[PDB]
């Protein structure tokens, strides 16, 4: 599974570009694509979404009417077109797969990312703690807070956990209340009810350090949490 | 013709020497299994609105 | 006269086992379970109708989560159903449209589908690559496949139409155990909760006890006068019921190896295509060819209610593993779920 | 409902659309149940490891044909022949150069009486009360040099007819077409063909054309 | 006592039309639904002629009290919807005969032309083509006060023009597009279907097959008769009246009312005949 981004770079203010992703190596026609950017001084933010077969389109409020998303299933490519982009859009964009059925794991795979630089009632997540000093082999439990409840009528909590290693793409870690993704070792545990959310790690390793993030998938847009970096 | 008949007779011969429980006790613990946990059977008694996700 | 002598002593020891079955009994189930409270009218209305098939359905199977059911039909499509919300989770295309068996793995990672092509196809559902693709092409059966129940994630028990059952593997694709002892084509199969014995149903009205580890018959059941079409296994593990093609359902004993009770009426004439229990063990679901099913009081041999509402003949029905509902597939491309 | 449930039902609607568009292809597919005796000449009509149903496909005059051979299946016929409700027509291939040799492997009966039993079993089914037959009586080229040396009466003690081509052929037509218990619902389409003759696919196309006309009179309330 | 029984005939035709087009519509909506390629067609016929079954009290009270105390817009829209439903009944009958001809004589194209999607597209297309005349009835409809006696009638009149050749062209156009092209298509489709179905291997071999062919032929000829010989007096009388100055009459002008009575009976008979002569409906009931 590969999501290789293309294009981008330094752009004049008020100009236009074309962010293309060569999403090959997997069944592109059965996955609802996304678009998540990350400011260099801030965290992750989702900007766009396209469902399978271009059925449903969702946009972020900051880029609605300014960004164009398009896909072509035979060519296995996901596009992102922006016009008159501002300096607020200075970020590095990630392509994300997301498949939706019963028991599926959305936001499973992420792309490497290409930098985009400009020359010169939403459920938000708060994590006050950051730069937590931890020791390898010990147990840590970070926390996450939601603006409203995430327990829907069908009896599950739509909270996503991630892990952004230094100089690496974000990876899906825990994709609901108390379940584990694919490839993640049976060490990261999720719990919590209502609006109070937390993570659980038994014995931290050398590759377990990084910035952790939250996400809700209950309403749109898809804003993230805050920085929860770990230090030795 | 020969080997199949030998296999059949030896199979039903090793079928012969098997201890058999009395059928009254089989019906007795059949009743016990059907009675000991008959309360949690939604097919017998219909589930309320809290249960029964089909609606 | 070696053949005549061996045949006559085989008949003598057959009368020995028949006399053992007769003399081991003391009383029937009627005159000891007729003093309990009868089951009332089981009026179960349909709740979810899983429309979307465009051909007749021969096989359905529930899951351990009791929410996802898979269905095989002659449309060339294997469809997994979210029974809670009436949703198609997957639609697996088939290389052969002629299939009459399907099974959902207890781990939920695999699904079986086989039939007249004499090849068992097992599809890997939850893959890192997002699609459903076949894992192994299990071949080696000379007859038509009829039931493909999953022993576990790595062993599958397939019953074919060449008087043989078989136990297969996944990492190799060979036959670990071949079961022989039937004279008619096997048309049904049912495992056990402890997963050590499984019963079969062949065309010669013979039901056996094939154990899994060493692989031979334990006892023989010949009570029907027509071929046994469907079989199902009691939740306790000491009984099982058979559905034949002569309007009779009947229980048996895993340990007493004797007839217990028959489930027949003067009104019903056509045969049984699908039979299953409830998890309490008192209700016995049974699908007939009169375009309807029925709930049978297993302790009273009384028709507790009808499940009419299917346009064509029901060919497959199974209950949930938590006893929540029964889903009755049929030849009208419909999947009625009753609760 | 949740956004994940909305995407799930959108995926279900897409799956329903895919099912509709590839079940639309099932209308143009004309299915033929090709079956007959072993080495009765059914191989020579399809010339122009599964060990199950032999699958072949061909098209002519803008009509898709699939021939569903069950010659490799030796199980009990009556418990899988009920799968063929939707077959357009039945191809019954029996040769004419089979009246003299009885079985060539065993000794119980003749090939002709085996064909009689097979045709009687397939004609009186509850599942085949309306399916037309495109019965092929092939190998007639080798039949005439085998009818001069041995008469037809060596297997039929009720023939008492002239030993020639036309009389024996007409008796064959009469003895194959009289097994239908309902000729007012199903007319057997007897036909002659050889190994190196012209195409019988025109006759097959005409027969399935008649069956499709019958279906079109059926579904419009005019039958 | 001449108008005593005529109003009773109008009332019983009204109630049997209501009963038939309610029962057929309810059965179609409940049991068979939009499954086949002809159930939607007979649904279109029922939804068309329900308006004709509901205009019976209007026609009856007009014939009874020789006037209309209604207004100026509502009888105009009654005339407009009457033209609309009548034309979309004739066009659906014509295209249903075309569909049957495609089913019989062209089996290679019947599977590609009798899909429910194609049938829905075709009937919606001919409904939108009838919408042109349906809105033209709104454009040029109205009322005109007669000079013989101070009563009025709902008819069509061109607004403030000589337009004698325009009116003649309109009358010959509606006559041609009613009983030239549709009747010609009905006849040359049904007789060619009969000729093809007679000379085919099926339906011409045994006594029962010959009786089936005879029943199909007599059914389609009864349908053709109920169409032609019942609806033809209305159009030929309108053509005779509009060809010249033959528009002055007497108490013998009740032949117009007998013609509209026949046109109101057969509009209710046709879906009843289809439902009670289709044995698929007999299995449905
Ligand atoms: C040349 O054919 C015609 O001009 C027409 C034929 C028909 C009957 C057949 C269907 C079409 C209609 C339209 C409607 C007319 C009347 C006007 C007076 C009021 C009645 C209710 N409807 C009409 C006289 O009758 C006209």
Compare all CA atoms of chain C with the CA of A24 and give the residue at the minimum distance: C129
Residue C249, strand partner residues: C243, C263
Residue of D52, D51, D55, D49 lying closest to D29 (CA atoms) = D55
Q: C223 and C259 in contact (C-beta within 8 Å)?
A: yes
Compare all CA atoms of chain C with the CA of B23 and give the residue at the minimum distance: C25
CATH number at residue A109: 2.60.40.10
Give the whole-angstrom CA distance, residue C36 versus residue B32.
12
Residue C278's alpha-carbon distances to A88, C235, C295, E106, in angstroms, are: 62, 8, 9, 54
Q: How many helices (H) and strands (E) does chain C have?
A: 2, 27
Give the whole-angstrom CA distance, residue C110 versus residue D197.
51
Give the whole-angstrom CA distance, residue E89 versus residue E48.
6
Cα Dmax for chain A: 50
SS3 C247: coil
Q: Which residues contact E163 (CB under 8 A, 6 or more apart)?
A: none
Q: D97 and D146 in contact (C-beta within 8 Å)?
A: yes
Residue D36, strand partner residues: D93
Q: A66 and A12 in contact (C-beta within 8 Å)?
A: no
Residue A61, strand partner residues: none
Residue C268's alpha-carbon distances to C51, C246, C247, in angstroms, are: 28, 9, 6
For chain D, the structural domain boundaries read 29-215
Q: A4 and A188 in contact (C-beta within 8 Å)?
A: no
Task: Identify the burial level of C173 via C-beta atoms within 10 angstroms of its C-beta, where 0-12 means exposed, 13-18 middle and 19 or more buried.
Answer: middle
Q: Which residues contact C63 (CB under 8 A, 6 or more apart)?
A: C69, C70, C104, C106, C108, C321
Give the whole-angstrom CA distance, residue A32 versus residue A95.
11
Which helix or strand (DSSP H or E) is residue C274 part of? strand C272-277
What chain E holds in terms of domains, given with CATH numbers, is: 2-284 (1.20.1070.10)
Q: C93 and C76 in contact (C-beta within 8 Å)?
A: yes
Give the whole-angstrom CA distance, residue A97 versus residue A2.
10
Place of tokens 């929410």: C67
Task: Identify the burial level of D85 via C-beta atoms within 10 angstroms of its C-beta, where 0-12 means exposed, 13-18 middle and 19 or more buried.
Answer: middle
Residue of E248, E254, E38 lying closest to E148 (CA atoms) = E248
Residue range D29-215 in CATH 3.40.50.300: yes
SS3 A101: coil
Q: Name subunits touching A (3+ CB pairs < 8 A).
A: C, D
Sign of the dihedral defined by the CA atoms of residues A16, A22, A23, A27, in that order: positive
How was this structure determined? It was done by: cryo-EM
For chain C, the structural domain boundaries read 1-339
Helix then strand then coil, in percent of chain D rounded to 5, is: 40, 15, 45
Residue E69's alpha-carbon distances to A184, C78, E62, E66, in angstroms, are: 83, 66, 9, 10
Give the whole-angstrom CA distance, residue D23 versus residue A217.
35
For chain B, the structural domain boundaries read 2-54
Cα Dmax for chain E: 69
Give the whole-angstrom CA distance, residue A183 versus residue A162.
13
Q: Give me the number of domains chain A comprises.
A: 2
Q: E220 and E227 in contact (C-beta within 8 Å)?
A: no
Judge whether B10 is closer than 8 Å to chain C, CB to CB.
Answer: no
Q: C91 and D56 in contact (C-beta within 8 Å)?
A: no
Q: Which residues contact E113 (CB under 8 A, 6 or more apart)?
A: E99, E102, E106
Residues of A in contact with C126 (CB under 8 A): 103
Residue range B2-54 in CATH 4.10.260.10: yes
Residues of E in contact with D209 (CB under 8 A): 107-108
Give the whole-angstrom CA distance, residue C77 versus residue C102.
12
Give the whole-angstrom CA distance, residue D64 versus residue D29.
5
Structure token pair of residue E43: 């649904």
Write the DSSP string, C158-197.
EE-SSSEEEEE-SSS-SEEEEEE--SS---EEE--SSSSE
Q: Best interface-test mutation with C: which of D24, D83, D84 has the largest number of C CBs within 10 A?
A: D83
- Quick one: which atom of ligand 1 is closest to the CA of E175? 1
Structure token pair of residue A49: 């979404």
E179, E234, E237, E267: residue to mutate for ligand 1 pocket, most atoms within 8 A of CB? E234
Q: A227 and A172 in contact (C-beta within 8 Å)?
A: no
Angle between helices E74-105 and E181-198 (to 10 degrees): 20
Residues in the ligand 1 pocket, defined by CB under 6 Å: E 82-83, 86, 171, 174-175, 178, 234-235, 238, 263
Q: E75 and E68 in contact (C-beta within 8 Å)?
A: yes
Q: E24 and E278 in contact (C-beta within 8 Å)?
A: no
Chain D touches chain B, with at least 3 Cβ pairs below 8 Å, answer: no
Which helix or strand (DSSP H or E) is residue C120 part of? strand C119-124
Structure token pair of residue E74: 């509502």
Strands (E), chain D: 29-36, 54-59, 64-69, 89-95, 132-133, 136-138, 191-192
Work out the minimum CA distance from A157 to partner chain D, whole angstroms. Answer: 11
Whole domain around residue A196: which residue ranges? 125-231
Residue of A175, A174, A220 lying closest to A58 (CA atoms) = A220
The answer to whether the Cβ–Cβ distance between B11 and C216 falls below 8 Å is yes
Sign of the dihedral defined by the CA atoms of residues E114, E115, E116, E120, in that order: negative
Q: Name subunits touching C (3+ CB pairs < 8 A).
A: A, B, D
| Cα–Cα–Cα angle for E63, E65, E70, rounded to 5 degrees | 95
Work out the minimum CA distance from A123 to partner chain D, whole angstroms. Answer: 14
Q: Best interface-test mutation with E: which of D23, D86, D216 has the largest number of E CBs within 10 A?
A: D216
| In D77-181, alpha helices (H) | 111-123, 141-149, 165-177
CA B36 remoteness from chain centre: 16
Which helix or strand (DSSP H or E) is residue C328 part of? strand C326-330
The answer to whether the Cβ–Cβ distance between E206 and D217 falls below 8 Å is no
Residues of D in contact with E36 (CB under 8 A): 219-220
Residue D130's alpha-carbon distances to C98, D85, D88, D122, E203, in angstroms, are: 21, 10, 10, 11, 13
Chain E touches chain A, with at least 3 Cβ pairs below 8 Å, answer: no
Place of tokens 């009186």: D124
**Bond prior to A221 in cis (omega within 30° of 0):** yes
Structure token pair of residue C307: 């499940």
| In chain C, alpha helices (H) | 2-24, 30-33
Give the whole-angstrom CA distance, residue A27 versus residue D205.
41
Q: Judging by DSSP bridges, how do beta strands C175-180 and A230-231 pair with one another?
A: unpaired
Judge whether D109 is closer than 8 Å to chain E, CB to CB.
Answer: no
CATH architecture type of domain C1-339 = 7 Propeller (2.130)
Q: How far apart are the two ends of chain E, measured CA to CA in Å?
A: 42
Q: C189 and C232 in contact (C-beta within 8 Å)?
A: no
Structure token pair of residue E185: 């298509």
Q: C100 and D79 in contact (C-beta within 8 Å)?
A: no
Residues of C in contact with A182 (CB under 8 A): 128
End position of a domain, from candidates A83, A118, A153: A118
Residue D74's alpha-carbon distances to A59, C98, C188, D42, D71, in angstroms, are: 61, 16, 19, 16, 8
E144, E235, E243: residue to mutate for ligand 1 pocket, most atoms within 8 A of CB? E235
Give the whole-angstrom CA distance, residue A6 versus residue A76.
14
Work out the minimum CA distance from A140 to partner chain D, whole angstroms. Answer: 31
Place of tokens 């009563």: E151
Q: Which residues contact E194 (CB under 8 A, 6 or more apart)?
A: E217, E220
Sign of the dihedral defined by the CA atoms of residues E90, E93, E98, E99, in that order: positive
Q: C160 and C144 in contact (C-beta within 8 Å)?
A: yes
Give the whole-angstrom CA distance, residue E178 versus residue E193.
22
Closest C-alpha to ligand 1, atom 19? E79
SS3 C142: coil
Q: Are residues A91 and A139 in the same domain?
A: no
Compare all CA atoms of chain B with the CA of C240 and give the residue at the minimum distance: B30
Residues of C in contact with D79 (CB under 8 A): 161, 185, 187, 203, 227
- Give the resolution to one decimal, in Å: 3.3
């Amino acid at each position: 599974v590969q999501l290789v981004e293309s294009g981008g770079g330094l752009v004049q203010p008020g100009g236009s570009r074309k962010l293309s992703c060569s999403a090959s190596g997997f069944a592109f026609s059965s996955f609802g694509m996304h678009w998540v950017r990350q400011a260099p001084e801030k965290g992750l933010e989702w900007v766009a979404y396209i469902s399978s077969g271009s059925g449903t389109i969702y946009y972020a409020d900051t880029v609605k009417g300014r960004f164009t998303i398009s896909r072509d299933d035979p060519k296995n490519t996901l596009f992102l077109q922006m016009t008159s982009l501002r300096s607020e859009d200075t970020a590095m964009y990630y392509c994300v797969r997301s498949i939706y059925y019963y028991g599926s794991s959305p936001f499973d795979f992420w792309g490497q990312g290409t930098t985009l630089t400009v020359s010169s009632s939403d459920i938000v997540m708060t994590q006050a703690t950051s730069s937590v000093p931890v020791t390898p082999g010990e147990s840590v439990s970070i926390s996450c807070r939601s603006s409203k409840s995430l327990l829907h009528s069908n009896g599950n909590t739509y909270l996503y956990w991630f892990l952004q290693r230094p100089g690496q793409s974000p990876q899906l870690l825990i994709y609901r209340m108390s379940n584990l993704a694919s490839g993640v070792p049976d060490r990261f545990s999720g719990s919590g009810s209502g609006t109070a959310f937390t993570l659980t790690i038994s014995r931290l390793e050398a590759e377990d350090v990084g910035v952790y993030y939250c996400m809700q998938h209950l309403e749109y847009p898809l804003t993230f949490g805050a920085g929860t970096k770990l230090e030795l | 013709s020969i080997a199949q008949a030998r296999k059949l007779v030896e199979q039903l011969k090793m079928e012969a020497n098997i201890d058999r429980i009395k059928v009254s006790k089989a019906a007795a613990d059949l009743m016990a299994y059907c009675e000991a946990h008959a309360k949690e059977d939604p097919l017998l008694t219909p589930v309320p609105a809290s249960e029964n996700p089909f609606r | 006269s070696e053949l005549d002598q061996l045949r006559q002593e085989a008949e003598q020891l057959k009368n020995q086992i028949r006399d053992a079955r007769k003399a081991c009994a003391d009383a029937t189930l009627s005159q000891i379970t007729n003093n309990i409270d009868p089951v009332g009218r089981i009026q179960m209305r349909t709740r979810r109708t899983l429309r979307g098939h465009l051909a007749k359905i021969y096989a359905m199977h529930w899951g351990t989560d009791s929410r996802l059911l898979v269905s095989a039909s002659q449309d060339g499509k294997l469809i997994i159903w979210d029974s809670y919300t009436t949703n198609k989770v997957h639609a697996i295309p088939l290389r052969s449209s002629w299939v009459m068996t399907c099974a959902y793995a207890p781990s939920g990672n695999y699904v079986a589908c086989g039939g007249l092509d004499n090849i068992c196809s097992i599809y890997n559902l939850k893959t890192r690559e997002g699609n459903v693709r076949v894992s192994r092409e299990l071949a080696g059966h000379t007859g038509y496949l009829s039931c493909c129940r999953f022993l576990d994630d790595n062993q599958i028990v397939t019953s074919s139409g060449d008087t043989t059952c078989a136990l297969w593997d996944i990492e190799t694709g060979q036959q670990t155990t071949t079961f022989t002892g039937h004279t008619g084509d096997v048309m049904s199969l049912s495992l056990a909760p402890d997963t050590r014995l499984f019963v079969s149903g062949a065309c010669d009205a013979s039901a056996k006890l094939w154990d899994v580890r060493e692989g031979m018959c334990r006892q023989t059941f010949t009570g029907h006068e027509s071929d046994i079409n469907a079989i199902c296994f009691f939740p306790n593990g000491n009984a099982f019921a058979t559905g034949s093609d002569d309007a009779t359902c009947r229980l048996f004993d895993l340990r007493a190896d004797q007839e217990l009770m028959t489930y027949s009426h003067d009104n019903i004439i056509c045969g049984i295509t699908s039979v299953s229990f409830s998890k309490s063990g008192r209700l016995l679901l049974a699908g007939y060819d009169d375009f309807n099913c029925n709930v049978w009081d297993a302790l009273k041999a009384d028709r507790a209610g009808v499940l009419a509402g299917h346009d064509n003949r029901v060919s497959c029905l199974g209950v949930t593993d938590d006893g929540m509902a029964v889903a009755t597939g049929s030849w009208d491309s419909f999947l009625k779920i009753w609760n | 409902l949740s956004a994940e449930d909305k995407a799930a039902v959108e995926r279900s609607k897409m799956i329903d659309r895919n099912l509709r568009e590839d079940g639309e292809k099932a209308a143009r597919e004309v299915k033929l149940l090709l079956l007959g005796a072993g080495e009765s000449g059914k191989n020579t009509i399809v010339k122009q490891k599964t060990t199950g149903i032999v699958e072949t496909h061909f098209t002519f005059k803008d009509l898709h044909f699939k021939m569903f051979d069950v010659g490799a299946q030796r199980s009990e016929r009556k418990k899988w022949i009920h799968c063929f409700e939707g077959v357009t027509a039945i191809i019954f291939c029996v040769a004419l150069s089979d009246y003299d040799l009885v079985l060539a492997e065993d000794e119980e009966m003749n090939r002709m009486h085996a064909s009689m039993k097979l045709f009687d079993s397939i004609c009186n089914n509850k599942w085949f009360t309306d399916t037309s037959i495109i019965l092929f009586l092939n190998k007639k080229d080798l039949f005439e040099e085998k009818i001069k040396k041995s008469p037809l009466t060596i297997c039929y003690p009720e023939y008492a007819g002239s030993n020639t081509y036309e009389e024996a052929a007409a008796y064959i037509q009469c003895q194959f077409e009289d097994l239908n218990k309902r000729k007012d619902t199903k007319e057997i389409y007897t036909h002659f063909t050889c190994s190196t003759d012209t195409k019988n696919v025109q006759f097959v196309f005409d027969a399935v054309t008649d069956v499709i006309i019958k279906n079109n009179l059926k579904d419009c309330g005019l039958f | 006592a001449i108008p005593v029984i005529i109003t009773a005939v109008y009332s019983v035709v009204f109630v049997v039309g209501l009963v038939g087009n309610s029962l057929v519509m309810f059965v179609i909506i409940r049991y068979t639904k939009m499954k086949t390629a002809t159930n939607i067609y007979i649904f279109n016929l029922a939804l068309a002629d329900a308006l004709v079954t509901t205009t019976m009290p209007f026609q009856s009270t007009v014939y009874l009290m020789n006037s209309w105390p209604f207004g100026d817009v509502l009888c105009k829209i009654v005339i407009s919807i009457d033209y609309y439903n009548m034309f979309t009944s004739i066009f659906t009958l014509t295209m249903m005969s075309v569909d049957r001809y495609i089913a019989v004589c062209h089996p290679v194209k019947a599977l590609d032309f009798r899909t429910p999607l194609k049938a829905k597209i075709i009937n919606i297309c001919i409904w939108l083509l009838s919408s042109s005349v349906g809105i033209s009835a709104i454009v040029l409809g109205g009322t005109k006060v007669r000079e013989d006696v101070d009563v009025i009638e709902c008819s069509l009149q061109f607004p403030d023009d000589d337009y004698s050749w325009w009116d003649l062209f309109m009358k010959i156009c509606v006559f041609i597009f009613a009983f030239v092209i549709p009747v010609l298509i009905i006849i040359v489709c049904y007789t060619l279907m009969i000729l093809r179905l007679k000379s085919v291997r099926l339906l011409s071999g045994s006594r029962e097959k010959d009786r089936n062919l005879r029943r199909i032929t007599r059914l389609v000829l009864v349908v053709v008769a109920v169409f032609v010989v019942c609806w033809t007096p209305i159009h030929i009388f309108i053509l005779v009246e509009a060809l010249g100055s033959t528009s002055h009459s007497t108490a013998a002008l009740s032949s117009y009312y007998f013609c509209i009575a026949l046109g109101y009976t057969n509009s209710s008979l046709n879906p009843i005949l289809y439902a009670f002569l289709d044995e698929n409906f007999k299995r449905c009931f």
